[PDB]
Amino acid sequence: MLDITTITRQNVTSVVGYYSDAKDDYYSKDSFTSWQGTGAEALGLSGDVESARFKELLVGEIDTFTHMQRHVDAKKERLGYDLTFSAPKGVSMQALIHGDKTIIEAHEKAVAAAVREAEKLAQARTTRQGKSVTQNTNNLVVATFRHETSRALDPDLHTHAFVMNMTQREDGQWRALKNDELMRNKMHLGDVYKQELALELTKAGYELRYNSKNNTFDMAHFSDEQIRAFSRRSEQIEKGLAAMGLTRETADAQTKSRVSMATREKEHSREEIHQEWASRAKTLGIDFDNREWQGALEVLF
DNA sequence: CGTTAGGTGT
Ligand SMILES: [Mn+2]
């Protein structure tokens, strides 16, 4: 389950929360950031993501000697690509309300696996014989940010895998990515994440259910209504489209994406949110004690 | 500065 958002100088204010949104989270200190990608290795980046270096690379400052010029209108300058890997809602509820670190490890492994596959799609433009050509570079600079809450204050385990708009070419020059291949492969990269996550959840003893219509899975001990109760943003987007005389099918991803920000809302202690999750789960009659190594293995092969 | 397009909705 992957979403791709292009971060430009116009909408860069959507990143203000990469660090603050994780404070007092359940598993943020065991941390919530990591440098990934062979490109990051080349730049000597590893471990936790420091805000100083992140902001430098965001604007194209690779070092004091090298600054990229990715504009011709700087307002439309592309700074990176937010690759958001979200876990299934039921998976989030079990990991965050009941509490199972094993699910956090699976999500991080599935994200790391998905980032590695994405690297095989990195492309850049050179010039040969006066003509412009395209080459495969096989390196990306990725800073991941793991969050536990949605904009509607629901449990939503997801990681922002921020891909800088830079790739090192064969000649050593750092240049802007040719994103075409990455955009076309959104669903494939989500499948890599889903496949790894499902395999790890199965090894942990969770019964999963499969939806062949949209090629997704989730926990099998949650009803379609119990999951809906913790999916307020999806409801807000459906109500938003309904106001436009549209449904999730009649609407295009172009408009549906804008309904997310337009419906998006802008102070509550994390202690309050967590307790609210438990009580609500108790109101719905949810029993989280369901890691018992049972089920018919619906998401096996 | 176009291009992707599970709804859980980044
Ligand atoms: Mn987030």
Short mmCIF file of all heavy atoms in Angstrom, two decimals, chain A residues 171-205:
data_model
loop_
_atom_site.label_atom_id
_atom_site.label_comp_id
_atom_site.label_asym_id
_atom_site.label_seq_id
_atom_site.Cartn_x
_atom_site.Cartn_y
_atom_site.Cartn_z
N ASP A 171 28.94 9.57 -14.66
CA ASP A 171 30.07 10.48 -14.62
C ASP A 171 30.27 11.14 -13.26
O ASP A 171 31.09 12.06 -13.14
CB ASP A 171 29.93 11.56 -15.70
CG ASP A 171 28.69 12.43 -15.53
OD1 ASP A 171 27.95 12.26 -14.54
OD2 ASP A 171 28.45 13.28 -16.42
N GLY A 172 29.56 10.69 -12.22
CA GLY A 172 29.72 11.23 -10.89
C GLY A 172 28.88 12.44 -10.58
O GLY A 172 28.82 12.85 -9.41
N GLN A 173 28.22 13.03 -11.57
CA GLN A 173 27.39 14.20 -11.35
C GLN A 173 26.07 13.82 -10.71
O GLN A 173 25.45 12.81 -11.07
CB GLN A 173 27.12 14.92 -12.68
CG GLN A 173 28.36 15.49 -13.33
CD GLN A 173 28.94 16.63 -12.53
OE1 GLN A 173 28.42 17.75 -12.55
NE2 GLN A 173 30.02 16.36 -11.81
N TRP A 174 25.62 14.64 -9.76
CA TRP A 174 24.31 14.48 -9.14
C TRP A 174 23.30 15.30 -9.92
O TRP A 174 23.46 16.51 -10.08
CB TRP A 174 24.35 14.92 -7.68
CG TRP A 174 25.15 14.03 -6.79
CD1 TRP A 174 26.49 14.08 -6.57
CD2 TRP A 174 24.65 12.95 -5.99
NE1 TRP A 174 26.86 13.10 -5.69
CE2 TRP A 174 25.75 12.40 -5.31
CE3 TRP A 174 23.38 12.41 -5.78
CZ2 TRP A 174 25.62 11.32 -4.44
CZ3 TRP A 174 23.25 11.34 -4.91
CH2 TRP A 174 24.37 10.81 -4.25
N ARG A 175 22.24 14.64 -10.42
CA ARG A 175 21.26 15.30 -11.26
C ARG A 175 19.86 14.89 -10.83
O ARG A 175 19.66 13.92 -10.09
CB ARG A 175 21.47 14.98 -12.75
CG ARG A 175 22.83 15.43 -13.30
CD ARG A 175 22.78 16.84 -13.87
NE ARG A 175 24.04 17.22 -14.51
CZ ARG A 175 25.10 17.69 -13.86
NH1 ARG A 175 25.10 17.84 -12.55
NH2 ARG A 175 26.20 18.00 -14.55
N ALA A 176 18.88 15.66 -11.30
CA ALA A 176 17.49 15.40 -10.94
C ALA A 176 17.02 14.07 -11.51
O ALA A 176 17.39 13.69 -12.63
CB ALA A 176 16.59 16.53 -11.45
N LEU A 177 16.21 13.37 -10.73
CA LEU A 177 15.68 12.09 -11.16
C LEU A 177 14.70 12.26 -12.32
O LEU A 177 14.03 13.30 -12.45
CB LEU A 177 14.98 11.39 -10.00
CG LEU A 177 15.86 10.54 -9.07
CD1 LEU A 177 15.33 10.61 -7.65
CD2 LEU A 177 15.93 9.10 -9.56
N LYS A 178 14.63 11.24 -13.16
CA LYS A 178 13.55 11.09 -14.14
C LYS A 178 12.52 10.19 -13.48
O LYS A 178 12.68 8.96 -13.45
CB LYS A 178 14.08 10.51 -15.45
CG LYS A 178 13.15 10.70 -16.63
CD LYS A 178 13.60 9.89 -17.84
CE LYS A 178 12.41 9.40 -18.65
NZ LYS A 178 12.79 8.99 -20.03
N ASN A 179 11.45 10.79 -12.94
CA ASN A 179 10.53 10.05 -12.08
C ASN A 179 9.59 9.13 -12.84
O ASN A 179 8.94 8.29 -12.21
CB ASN A 179 9.72 11.04 -11.22
CG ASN A 179 8.80 11.94 -12.03
OD1 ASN A 179 8.30 11.55 -13.09
ND2 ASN A 179 8.59 13.16 -11.55
N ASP A 180 9.52 9.25 -14.17
CA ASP A 180 8.50 8.53 -14.94
C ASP A 180 8.40 7.07 -14.52
O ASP A 180 7.31 6.57 -14.23
CB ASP A 180 8.82 8.63 -16.44
CG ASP A 180 8.93 10.07 -16.91
OD1 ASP A 180 9.22 10.95 -16.07
OD2 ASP A 180 8.75 10.31 -18.12
N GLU A 181 9.53 6.37 -14.49
CA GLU A 181 9.51 4.94 -14.17
C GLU A 181 8.99 4.69 -12.76
O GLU A 181 8.28 3.71 -12.52
CB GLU A 181 10.91 4.35 -14.32
CG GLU A 181 11.43 4.33 -15.74
CD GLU A 181 10.59 3.46 -16.65
OE1 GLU A 181 10.04 2.45 -16.16
OE2 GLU A 181 10.47 3.78 -17.85
N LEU A 182 9.34 5.56 -11.82
CA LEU A 182 8.89 5.35 -10.45
C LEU A 182 7.38 5.51 -10.34
O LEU A 182 6.72 4.73 -9.64
CB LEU A 182 9.60 6.33 -9.51
CG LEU A 182 10.55 5.76 -8.45
CD1 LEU A 182 10.86 6.83 -7.41
CD2 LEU A 182 9.99 4.52 -7.76
N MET A 183 6.82 6.50 -11.03
CA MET A 183 5.37 6.71 -10.97
C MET A 183 4.62 5.54 -11.59
O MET A 183 3.60 5.10 -11.05
CB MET A 183 5.01 8.01 -11.68
CG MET A 183 5.67 9.23 -11.09
SD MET A 183 4.93 9.72 -9.53
CE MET A 183 5.72 11.31 -9.29
N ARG A 184 5.10 5.02 -12.72
CA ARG A 184 4.43 3.90 -13.37
C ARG A 184 4.45 2.64 -12.52
O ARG A 184 3.60 1.76 -12.70
CB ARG A 184 5.09 3.60 -14.71
CG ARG A 184 4.89 4.67 -15.77
CD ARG A 184 5.48 4.25 -17.11
NE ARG A 184 5.65 2.80 -17.20
CZ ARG A 184 6.81 2.18 -17.41
NH1 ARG A 184 7.93 2.85 -17.61
NH2 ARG A 184 6.83 0.85 -17.44
N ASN A 185 5.41 2.52 -11.60
CA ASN A 185 5.61 1.32 -10.81
C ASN A 185 5.07 1.46 -9.39
O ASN A 185 5.49 0.70 -8.50
CB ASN A 185 7.09 0.95 -10.78
CG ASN A 185 7.54 0.25 -12.05
OD1 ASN A 185 7.65 -0.97 -12.09
ND2 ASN A 185 7.81 1.03 -13.10
N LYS A 186 4.16 2.40 -9.14
CA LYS A 186 3.65 2.59 -7.79
C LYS A 186 3.02 1.30 -7.26
O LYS A 186 3.34 0.84 -6.16
CB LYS A 186 2.63 3.73 -7.75
CG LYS A 186 2.10 4.03 -6.35
CD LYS A 186 1.15 5.22 -6.34
CE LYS A 186 -0.24 4.81 -6.79
NZ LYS A 186 -1.19 5.95 -6.77
N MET A 187 2.14 0.68 -8.05
CA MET A 187 1.45 -0.52 -7.58
C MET A 187 2.42 -1.67 -7.36
O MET A 187 2.29 -2.42 -6.38
CB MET A 187 0.35 -0.91 -8.57
CG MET A 187 -0.68 0.18 -8.83
SD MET A 187 -1.45 0.84 -7.33
CE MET A 187 -3.00 -0.06 -7.33
N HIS A 188 3.40 -1.83 -8.25
CA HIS A 188 4.38 -2.90 -8.07
C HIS A 188 5.15 -2.72 -6.76
O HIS A 188 5.36 -3.68 -6.02
CB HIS A 188 5.34 -2.94 -9.25
CG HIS A 188 6.53 -3.83 -9.03
ND1 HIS A 188 6.42 -5.18 -8.83
CD2 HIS A 188 7.86 -3.54 -8.98
CE1 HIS A 188 7.62 -5.70 -8.66
NE2 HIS A 188 8.51 -4.73 -8.75
N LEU A 189 5.57 -1.49 -6.46
CA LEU A 189 6.31 -1.24 -5.23
C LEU A 189 5.44 -1.48 -4.00
O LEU A 189 5.93 -1.93 -2.96
CB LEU A 189 6.85 0.19 -5.22
CG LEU A 189 7.92 0.51 -6.26
CD1 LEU A 189 8.26 2.00 -6.21
CD2 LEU A 189 9.16 -0.34 -6.03
N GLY A 190 4.15 -1.16 -4.09
CA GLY A 190 3.24 -1.50 -3.01
C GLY A 190 3.12 -3.00 -2.81
O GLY A 190 3.05 -3.48 -1.68
N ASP A 191 3.10 -3.75 -3.91
CA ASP A 191 3.01 -5.21 -3.81
C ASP A 191 4.23 -5.80 -3.12
O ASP A 191 4.12 -6.73 -2.33
CB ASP A 191 2.84 -5.82 -5.20
CG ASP A 191 1.44 -5.63 -5.76
OD1 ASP A 191 0.49 -5.51 -4.96
OD2 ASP A 191 1.30 -5.62 -7.00
N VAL A 192 5.42 -5.27 -3.43
CA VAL A 192 6.63 -5.72 -2.74
C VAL A 192 6.46 -5.51 -1.24
O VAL A 192 6.70 -6.42 -0.44
CB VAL A 192 7.86 -4.98 -3.28
CG1 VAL A 192 9.06 -5.17 -2.37
CG2 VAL A 192 8.18 -5.45 -4.69
N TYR A 193 6.03 -4.31 -0.84
CA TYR A 193 5.81 -4.05 0.57
C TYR A 193 4.75 -4.99 1.14
O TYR A 193 4.95 -5.61 2.20
CB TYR A 193 5.39 -2.58 0.76
CG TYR A 193 4.77 -2.29 2.11
CD1 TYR A 193 5.57 -2.00 3.21
CD2 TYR A 193 3.39 -2.29 2.28
CE1 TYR A 193 5.01 -1.74 4.44
CE2 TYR A 193 2.83 -2.03 3.51
CZ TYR A 193 3.64 -1.75 4.58
OH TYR A 193 3.10 -1.49 5.81
N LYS A 194 3.63 -5.14 0.44
CA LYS A 194 2.56 -6.00 0.93
C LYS A 194 3.03 -7.44 1.06
O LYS A 194 2.75 -8.10 2.07
CB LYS A 194 1.34 -5.90 0.01
CG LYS A 194 0.55 -4.61 0.17
CD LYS A 194 -0.72 -4.61 -0.65
CE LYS A 194 -0.42 -4.68 -2.14
NZ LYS A 194 -1.44 -3.96 -2.96
N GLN A 195 3.74 -7.94 0.05
CA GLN A 195 4.17 -9.34 0.07
C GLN A 195 5.11 -9.61 1.24
O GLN A 195 4.97 -10.62 1.93
CB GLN A 195 4.86 -9.69 -1.25
CG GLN A 195 3.90 -10.07 -2.36
CD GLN A 195 4.61 -10.60 -3.60
OE1 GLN A 195 5.61 -11.30 -3.50
NE2 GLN A 195 4.09 -10.25 -4.77
N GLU A 196 6.08 -8.73 1.46
CA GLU A 196 6.99 -8.90 2.59
C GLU A 196 6.24 -8.79 3.91
O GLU A 196 6.45 -9.59 4.82
CB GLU A 196 8.11 -7.87 2.52
CG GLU A 196 9.21 -8.08 3.55
CD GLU A 196 10.12 -9.24 3.19
OE1 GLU A 196 11.09 -9.03 2.44
OE2 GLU A 196 9.86 -10.37 3.66
N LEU A 197 5.37 -7.78 4.03
CA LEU A 197 4.62 -7.61 5.27
C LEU A 197 3.76 -8.84 5.56
O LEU A 197 3.74 -9.34 6.69
CB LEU A 197 3.77 -6.34 5.20
CG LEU A 197 2.92 -6.04 6.44
CD1 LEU A 197 3.79 -5.82 7.67
CD2 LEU A 197 2.03 -4.83 6.18
N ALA A 198 3.06 -9.35 4.54
CA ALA A 198 2.22 -10.52 4.74
C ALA A 198 3.04 -11.73 5.17
O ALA A 198 2.64 -12.48 6.06
CB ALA A 198 1.45 -10.83 3.46
N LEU A 199 4.20 -11.94 4.54
CA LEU A 199 5.06 -13.06 4.91
C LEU A 199 5.52 -12.94 6.36
O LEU A 199 5.54 -13.93 7.10
CB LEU A 199 6.26 -13.14 3.97
CG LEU A 199 6.01 -13.78 2.61
CD1 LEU A 199 7.08 -13.35 1.61
CD2 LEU A 199 5.97 -15.29 2.71
N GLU A 200 5.90 -11.73 6.79
CA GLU A 200 6.38 -11.56 8.15
C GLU A 200 5.24 -11.69 9.16
O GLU A 200 5.42 -12.25 10.24
CB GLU A 200 7.08 -10.21 8.30
CG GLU A 200 8.41 -10.11 7.58
CD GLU A 200 9.47 -11.03 8.16
OE1 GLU A 200 9.50 -11.22 9.40
OE2 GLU A 200 10.29 -11.56 7.38
N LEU A 201 4.06 -11.16 8.82
CA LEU A 201 2.92 -11.30 9.72
C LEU A 201 2.51 -12.76 9.83
O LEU A 201 2.12 -13.22 10.91
CB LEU A 201 1.75 -10.45 9.22
CG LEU A 201 1.92 -8.94 9.37
CD1 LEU A 201 0.77 -8.20 8.70
CD2 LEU A 201 2.00 -8.56 10.84
N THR A 202 2.60 -13.51 8.73
CA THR A 202 2.28 -14.94 8.78
C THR A 202 3.28 -15.69 9.65
O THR A 202 2.89 -16.59 10.41
CB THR A 202 2.27 -15.51 7.36
OG1 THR A 202 1.21 -14.90 6.61
CG2 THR A 202 2.09 -17.02 7.38
N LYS A 203 4.56 -15.34 9.57
CA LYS A 203 5.55 -15.97 10.43
C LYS A 203 5.33 -15.64 11.90
O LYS A 203 5.79 -16.38 12.77
CB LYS A 203 6.96 -15.56 10.01
CG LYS A 203 7.43 -16.21 8.71
CD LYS A 203 8.36 -15.29 7.93
CE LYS A 203 9.69 -15.09 8.64
NZ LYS A 203 10.71 -14.44 7.77
N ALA A 204 4.63 -14.54 12.19
CA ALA A 204 4.34 -14.15 13.57
C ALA A 204 3.10 -14.83 14.13
O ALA A 204 2.88 -14.77 15.35
CB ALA A 204 4.17 -12.63 13.66
N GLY A 205 2.29 -15.46 13.29
CA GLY A 205 1.11 -16.16 13.74
C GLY A 205 -0.19 -15.38 13.63
O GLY A 205 -1.08 -15.59 14.46
#
